[PDB]
Amino acid sequence: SDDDGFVEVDGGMKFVYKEEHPFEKRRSEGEKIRKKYPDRVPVIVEKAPKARIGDLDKKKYLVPSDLTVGQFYFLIRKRIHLRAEDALFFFVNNVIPPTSATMGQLYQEHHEEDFFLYIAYSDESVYGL
Numbered sequence: 001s002d003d004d005g006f007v008e009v010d011g012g013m014k015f016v017y018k019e020e021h022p023f024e025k026r027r028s029e030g031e032k033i034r035k036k037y038p039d040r041v042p043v044i045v046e047k048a049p050k051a052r053i054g055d056l057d058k059k060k061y062l063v064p065s066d067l068t069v070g071q072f073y074f075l076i077r078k079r080i081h082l083r084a085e086d087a088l089f090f091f092v093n094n095v096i097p098p099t100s101a102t103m104g105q106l107y108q109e110h111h112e113e114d115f116f117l118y119i120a121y122s123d124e125s126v127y128g129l
Contacts, residue, residue, distance in 0.1 A: 012093060012112050013120055013127075017044045017059055023114060030115025033062065040064050041107035043117045045076060048091060050129060051122035054080035065104025069097050076121060091120045091127045 012018075018026070033042050043061040047053065056079060063072060069090065077088050089096055092110045107117040120127060 010093070012118055013091070014049075015044060015046050015118055015120075017046060017118075026114035026116060030111075034115055037062060039066075041103055041111070041117060042115065043072075043103065043107070043119060045119045045121060048120040048122040048127050051124070053086075053088070053121070053123040054082065056080050056121070063103045065102060065107070067103050068099065069101050069103060069106060070099030072103055073099060087123055087125070089122050089125045091122070092118065094127050096125065 030042055033040075040062050043063050044059050045056060045061060046059055047056060056076065058079070061072075073088065073090060076090075080088075082088055092106060097106050103117070111117045122129070
């Protein structure tokens with residue numbers, strides 16, 4: 001007992017979506033949309049702190065699970081009208097996901113307790129820079 005160790009609970013990253021939608025309501029929607037569309041995953045995308053980059057009109061995406069991170073990357077780039085030479089990086093829990101992974105795998109490994117996957121985007125490869 002002298003060495004009892006804390007469990008470090010992971011809350012994920014800060015999102016406006018999480019501040020504006022009560023957790024219990026988020027979890028209800030995440031569970032239900034996964035039953036409605038078992039081959040898709042619900043995703044929240046928001047601009048990271050200090051990013052200097054175009055705004056993203058819509059934060060909520062219902063994504064076929066077999067689409068890759070790289071495909072979703074080009075989708076988001078197009079929605080913010082980024083030029084090809086401009087950078088865009090995604091972060092899930094402060095880590096850049098590999099482009100070859102499926103969105104389904106990223107969701108399975110990293111969805112939060114509300115059954116959403118949370119992605120932040122930035123112009124920089126360091127979250128918050």
